[PDB]
Nucleic acid binder design. Structure first.
Ligand SMILES: [Ca+2]
Ligand SMILES: [Ca+2]
Lengths: 289, 288
DNA sequence: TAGTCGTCGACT
DNA sequence: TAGTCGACGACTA
């Protein structure tokens, strides 16, 4: 179907009002999983980007967790829901030798303590750069997941992660989305450069400093929204990075309204039958309006 | 200009006149204490200048790195007067690259500069193992890794197996082997596993043909015992040096005795500022 | 006989 | 909202 394309201000307002921005964060907060399980759930989720599967895997411990993760990485043995071991679209490439070498890296480093990976990435928080560099130590973990982890370390784990001036470090898609926005969104004021000249409204010549000008205007725009999952602070670059990215998909025909909440529940219902944590995941998931 | 020799005749010259690698003989003769030898080597592996390395080898602990950072910065004068010299092979060990290299060594060895060469040497091992240890250090890449690995065996006497190392030789010796298969009629045709003959064309030489070339030259020089002490027949380590120096000879950049002549001229000044530098100059082999 | 870096394209 | 590999050219007095 070919739906109405919304402005970023209205599409973002929907993402915030319906908690369709990042529903996994709400569900996770609702589950109140114990620490070691939460860390296993997270490492699984950052590998496969599938909430129900991470729930199933979060119930295995120690070397039995990595053994079950290597089975999902090899995707030869069937899955407890039947079929192959599913991947989230953002992790579609976590397969073959890339997935298995990834698991050998983690097994070599964490041995019988898989809970330590998220604990090490989380630390006691820190700056976005410090957190993302810790994430990016692990094989098959790059710039997208580093940013995602840093978001979750703050939104889910409650550690203090400073994202100040991260806009220039956003992953290619939210960054390209900021470039398009400077060109096409008239509500974004002109970016007056230090020489007094205006930055050209051309997505192909948008510099890091204009992306920062873009993100800073959007943050101010949404400042009347408290950030989900708990509404503890106003929106910052972490939510704006997500609004930027999903808006580009929305405009491209690849993000109809509620896409994430609908997609999460559909792929998670099978797992709700093989794992009590998966059943708690599906029931903690928010719903469409 | 000068007469360009075949590899067989040019290599025989390098072996007979100890012009192949004269620093190894000089080092063996100096018989320096263990910790100083490791400091001499680390300095040489950064600056590739024997006299300069000899001078710096006499400072110990953190005073060694302070003086090495001075050579890396090249802003204070040098005890020889002028700038802190570099060997041509280390012409790029300068600026932020040199200081980054030295900072890396300080961060890792602190007050024990002797530990760098000892870690590289370990108890020996495979060429591959040693060059990977060497190449952990900043501004240490494949050329110096192969060089250090050669020196751990030729100078430090630890057992380094170089078997089948031909396919790993650095850019220039490897290109020398490619040129050699094209131009040297003494190298027999390389018959591949499928029975086909590899073409006599330097731009289409594969690793297995480079190995085949290296293996033929090893056999050719097998009547030569390897310097510095003639403990074993020539292997891929000397042939790799003959290959590269022959490519240079052919390019006009290595007339006979080039290395022995250049080292002594760049080392004489240092003989006056360091007792070790004078012993180095006196242990250095001579022309003819 | 130099080593390091970033871009790009191909691959999974 | 993916990450890794190798090939290549530019750069470093
Ligand atoms: Ca995001
Ligand atoms: Ca050599």
């Amino acid at each position: 179907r070919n739906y109405e394309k919304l402005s970023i201000e209205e599409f973002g307002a929907h993402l915030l009002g319906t908690v369709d921005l990042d529903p996994i964060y709400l569900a996770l907060r609702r589950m109140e999983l114990p620490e070691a399980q939460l860390n296993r759930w997270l490492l699984a989720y950052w590998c496969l980007y599938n909430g129900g599967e991470a729930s199933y895997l979060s119930e295995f411990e120690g070397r039995e967790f990595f053994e079950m993760l290597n089975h999902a990485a090899e995707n030869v043995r069937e899955a407890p829901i039947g079929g192959r071991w599913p991947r989230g679209a953002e992790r579609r490439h976590w397969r073959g030798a890339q997935a298995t070498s990834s698991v050998e890296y983690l097994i070599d480093r964490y041995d019988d303590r898989p809970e330590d990976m998220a604990a090490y990435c989380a630390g006691q928080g820190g700056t976005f750069l410090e957190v993302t560099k810790r994430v990016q130590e692990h094989r098959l973990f790059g710039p997208w997941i580093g940013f995602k982890v840093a978001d979750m370390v703050d939104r889910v784990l409650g550690k203090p992660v400073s994202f100040d001036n991260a806009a220039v470090f956003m992953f290619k898609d939210p960054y390209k989305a900021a470039c398009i926005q400077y060109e096409v969104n008239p509500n974004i004021p002109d970016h007056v450069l230090a020489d007094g000249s205006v930055a050209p409204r051309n997505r192909e010549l948008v510099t890091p400093e204009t992306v920062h000008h873009v993100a800073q205007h959007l943050i101010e725009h949404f400042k009347g929204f408290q950030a989900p999952p708990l509404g503890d602070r106003p929106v910052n670059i972490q939510e704006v990075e997500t609004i930027l990215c999903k808006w580009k998909s929305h405009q491209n025909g690849h993000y109809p309204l509620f896409k994430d909440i609908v997609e999460i529940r559909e792929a998670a219902l099978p797992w709700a039958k093989v794992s009590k944590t998966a059943q708690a995941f599906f029931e903690a998931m928010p719903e469409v309006t």
